[PDB]
Design a protein around this ligand. Structure first.
Ligand SMILES: [Mn+2]
Ligand SMILES: [Mn+2]
Ligand code: NA
Ligand code: NA
Lengths: 349, 349
């Protein structure tokens, strides 16, 4: 099915006649426009139109699968007004500011603006071959840079300086770091939400490297933990347990599997190995135009995996004050299983 | 005056009894909390409270000048509800999403939520000595890195690689690039909104470097243009005109001067030197917790400079297809004039 034909039944079920698309990832998903922060799309009974300004005339003509109307706000949505007269027009309430909604309400007095909250969550969950190709290119860049930087990860090096080297090489390659880099050594390994500090890596530390590349608008995401010297017996057990959990959850991926059941498989396994008050509260997430997008692999998830989805699998176990381990791979769901896209080594410790 | 005593009369004039502060820069401005994306402040007739979750208990106790209530959303604003019963509660409509407003409306059914749009613009325009000190530290880092990287800017080097070197050194120093770096050489100098491309710098090019450092939460901002080899007679005239405009506008800074009149001084000067269909449409902006904040130096501005404000002055002239020049300094308004905070050399071409 075409993207528009995927979207329209979702709008029907949501009880709207039209949709003002303002989230940059959904503007780009629908239209192909790659400067989507400066575009908007109106989906309506008359079709679908990309709105952007005259700086982007040539670029939008070349990129957009949708006809274009060229103007700056507020001319864009004022021009759109007659198209939406008498209609229920959905908008993306998790994205749109109150001021932006006020602007639309003033411009469309003969329309009913309808807030959509979770409605479009996971709209982009299934990727086309072209999209998968772009994600592969991003992840291949991430793997190349990780493999280049890995030998620098040794005693005497600051976490921060490992992160700098990763960022440097991603940028020199024409990409960028997809999110704030995590290089978490020793007790810093036990803090999720920690990034890369000035802490110097020492012999006996595990080091967790959580990184991704954004390249051509698409993201990748992986996590590795490595040993510098010989870790404690305890941190080795932690590492082996998390690796066991990761490889077990990956091996259950197939069309039709419930995201929540993957989460349960990992938490049960960690619990059997003594780590069931220590683990991460989501197992993973979709990756695409955003680093974090649908589906979600929480215990409460109602998502069901299908072929073409790209997700992470990332069990984690944290021992506050001591250390912690995360290991994550980027996975493509296939017609009868999965394909691991992230190829960097997973080492023993 | 204290920050709260600055804010309360603004709220009075705006016709509200209370304010839900959600913009991270204003959460931090009022409270001192430095992880302000994960905090909110309620200003009310009962006082002012910082809301954040238990991950931040110790940090918020140490940092916050305001009492704290520790919880995750929605417990935070549900706990706040009885404080705002019967009140007109302002919220920051340019920041808050529609979904976030819906959440507050459900939690505060006996309150009236009042959208504030431009109300708090320039709230943070005047800086304290401590704030100025933080901005000086950021700009000093920017100057140090610019001076280190300047000699690499030569024929044969990609724009992108100059940007990478800047980013690398800012990050290694414990800061970061404040915004997407611009290194614009040759005809790329004529494109505002261009950043750093793979274009190789050549003899005869001007190169425009637009950069800032974020350090300890505060930003800096400057722009330099330099010559690689000998530029055309025309681009030299452009450079000299823009430098003349910049130094003229800076020299008019004092308490009481109108931001719009600074803009007029620069556009008149560029027009006298043949560049009055070529120039930038704002002369500059405040800098602080955000790179772009009040005041604004557009022709339509109603802002008036006062002592303690930190602003940029940045005339620009662009010759599409040929080249362009921007030059910018970061300026502190003083009791009877100004002080230039950005110290990097401004060269002849
Ligand atoms: Mn990761
Ligand atoms: Mn600048
Ligand atoms: Na991954
Ligand atoms: Na400046």
């Amino acid at each position: 099915s075409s993207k528009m034909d995927q979207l329209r039944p979702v709008l029907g079920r949501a009880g709207v006649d039209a949709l003002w698309v303002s989230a940059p990832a959904n503007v780009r998903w629908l239209s192909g426009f790659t400067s989507a922060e400066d575009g908007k799309v109106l989906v309506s009974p008359d079709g679908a139109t990309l709105y952007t300004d005259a700086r982007y005339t040539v670029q939008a003509q070349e990129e957009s699968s949708l006809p274009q109307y060229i103007a700056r706000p507020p001319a864009t949505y004022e021009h759109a007004a007659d198209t939406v007269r008498g209609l229920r027009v959905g908008f993306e309430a998790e994205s749109l500011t109150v001021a932006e909604l006020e602007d639309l309400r003033q411009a469309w007095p003969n329309s009913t603006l309808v807030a959509l909250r979770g409605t479009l969550g996971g709209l982009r969950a299934v990727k086309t071959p072209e999209e998968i190709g772009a994600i592969r290119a991003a992840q291949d860049l991430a793997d190349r840079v990780y493999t280049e930087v890995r030998p620098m990860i040794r005693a005497g090096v600051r976490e921060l300086d490992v992160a700098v080297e990763i960022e440097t090489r991603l940028r020199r390659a024409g990409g960028e770091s997809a999110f704030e880099l995590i290089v978490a050594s020793g007790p810093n390994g036990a803090k999720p939400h920690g990034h890369a500090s000035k802490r110097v890596i020492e012999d006996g530390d595990l080091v967790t490297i959580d990184m991704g590349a954004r390249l051509g608008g698409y993201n990748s995401d992986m996590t590795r933990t490595v040993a510098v010297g010989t870790p404690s017996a305890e941190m080795k057990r932690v590492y082996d347990a998390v690796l066991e959990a990761e490889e077990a959850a990956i091996a259950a991926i197939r069309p039709g599997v419930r995201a929540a059941d993957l989460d349960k498989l990992a938490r049960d396994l960690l619990t059997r190995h003594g780590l069931g008050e220590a683990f991460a509260h989501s197992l993973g997430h979709g990756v695409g135009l955003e680093v974090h997008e649908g589906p979600g692999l929480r215990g409460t998830s109602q998502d069901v995996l299908e072929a073409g989805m790209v997700i992470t699998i990332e069990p984690g176990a944290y021992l506050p004050g001591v250390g912690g381990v995360r290991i994550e791979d980027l996975i493509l769901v296939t017609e009868d299983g999965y394909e691991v896209l992230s190829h960097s080594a997973k080492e023993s410790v």
